[PDB]
Structure 1
Amino acid sequence: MSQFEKQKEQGNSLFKQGLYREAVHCYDQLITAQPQNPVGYSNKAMALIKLGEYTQAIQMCQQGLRYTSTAEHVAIRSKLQYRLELAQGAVGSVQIPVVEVDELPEGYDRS
């Protein structure tokens, strides 16, 4: 079933150009073929953090943790808990450590 793994990478790549409605069409394919699987909601939560609506993604990750009760869905249980951390990650990070010279934004303390 590897086509459904490269079609979600096409979705992320389309959000990386600005083709947001074709990128949404790629998550919508997953829920079109799998209407009741939490995989499709995990890819909608991905699309929301790739369209800058992280306030929806922090709620939708809680909604997807409600799809975890069996040994069929232990991967889903990890998948929405890292999606929740990385929604808060993508909104809350600023990449400035304000100390040393290990990474930094460009310039800052090496000019």
Structure 2
Amino acid sequence: GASPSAQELKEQGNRLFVGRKYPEAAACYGRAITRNPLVAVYYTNRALCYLKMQQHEQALADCRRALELDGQSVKAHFFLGQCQLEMESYDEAIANLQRAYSLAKEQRLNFGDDIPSALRIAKKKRWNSIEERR
């Protein structure tokens, strides 16, 4: 047999993700991480798998690790913020989305109104959660 490289495992996971096989993709990214745990994008990609599978604590842990390895990552701040938003950690989520936005502008990766839209939605969900209380 052949043992694929971590990079090959990441690409295989990407094809599994494109194939909408999210548990399988997550496991493949996990094999990539085992082969080389110092590459942030393996964790961010697996985090997105876990968000598609609504496995929040696993996504959260992966976003934290990705950001330890690449503190400049637009994607990992965005996914961290999305995971926090879904766990109703609103203020943390918003701050991570604002950092994703600022990093994206700096890197010229701010596409359309995407991250500002995520920020508006996060802020409105936070606002609704307070406004709806008795």
The TM-score normalised by the length of structure 2 is: 0.48
Alignment partner of 1:55 is 2:81:
no
8 A contact 1:45–1:83 mirrored in 2: no
**Percent identity of equivalent pairs:** 10
Tell me the distance in 1 between the aligned counterparts of 2:56 and 2:81.
14
Q: 1:6 offset after TM fit, Å? A: 5.7
Q: 1:45 offset after TM fit, Å? A: 0.6
The unaligned stretches of length 5 or more in structure 2 are 1-10, 15-28, 30-41, 130-134
Distance 1:85 1:36, change over 3 A: same
Runs of 4+ in 1 over 4 A off after TM superposition: 3-6
8 A contact 1:42–1:79 mirrored in 2: no
2:119 is matched with 84
1:101 is matched with none
8 A contact 2:48–2:79 mirrored in 1: no
The answer to which structure, 1 or 2, has the higher relative contact order (CA under 8 A, 6+ apart) is 1
Alignment of 1:29-68 (within 5 A): 29-32=65-68, 34-67=70-103, 68=105
The unaligned stretches of length 5 or more in structure 1 are 94-111
The TM-score normalised by the length of structure 1 is: 0.56
2:51 is matched with 12
Tell me the distance in 2 between the aligned counterparts of 1:12 and 1:27.
11
Alignment of 1:17-32 (within 5 A): 20-32=56-68
In structure 2, which of residues 103, 107, 110 is the aligned counterpart of residue 74 of structure 1? 110
Tell me the distance in 1 between the aligned counterparts of 2:76 and 2:107.
18
Tell me the distance in 2 between the aligned counterparts of 1:32 and 1:56.
17
- Tell me which protein shows more helix as a share of its residues: 2
